[PDB]
Design a binder for this molecule. Structure first.
Ligand SMILES: [Cl-]
Ligand SMILES: [Cl-]
Ligand code: NA
Length: 129
């Protein structure tokens, strides 16, 4: 599924991401835009052989099991394919654990490089929430 920008903002708000750990909704929409272009089916392989999954590009090195990242962990206790569903619940629940692990949203490179320090409220402008 390829979300509309306001559609995704509304789905994230319902799932408790607005203000989660102090990160307003615009930050999460911004990160999703640049990580996956709002596409739940996005996958990208990393140099170390791990893969990033889903609309927040969660990494199999630490967070999910894809059966092909030797020596990796599965801290979110999920198959990585659950991160590609049209239902964003599993991605959101796992992102909540990531952003709480001490490093906030700096875990998402695109957030650090393209959202941090910008007017992220622009990403939820005009949406009915
Ligand atoms: Cl915001
Ligand atoms: Cl980047
Ligand atoms: Na893993």
């Amino acid at each position: 599924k390829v979300f509309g920008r306001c559609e995704l903002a509304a789905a994230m708000k319902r799932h408790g991401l607005d203000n989660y750990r102090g990160y307003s909704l615009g930050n999460w929409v911004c990160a999703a835009k640049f990580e996956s272009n709002f596409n739940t089916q996005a996958t990208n392989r990393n140099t170390d052989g791990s893969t990033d999954y889903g609309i927040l590009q969660i990494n199999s090195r630490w967070w999910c099991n894809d059966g092909r990242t030797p020596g990796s962990r599965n801290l979110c206790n999920i198959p990585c394919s659950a991160l590609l569903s049209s239902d964003i619940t599993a991605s959101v629940n796992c992102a909540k654990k990531i952003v709480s692990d001490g490093n906030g949203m700096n875990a998402w490179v695109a957030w650090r490089n393209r959202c941090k320090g910008t007017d992220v409220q622009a990403w939820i402008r005009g949406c009915r929430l």
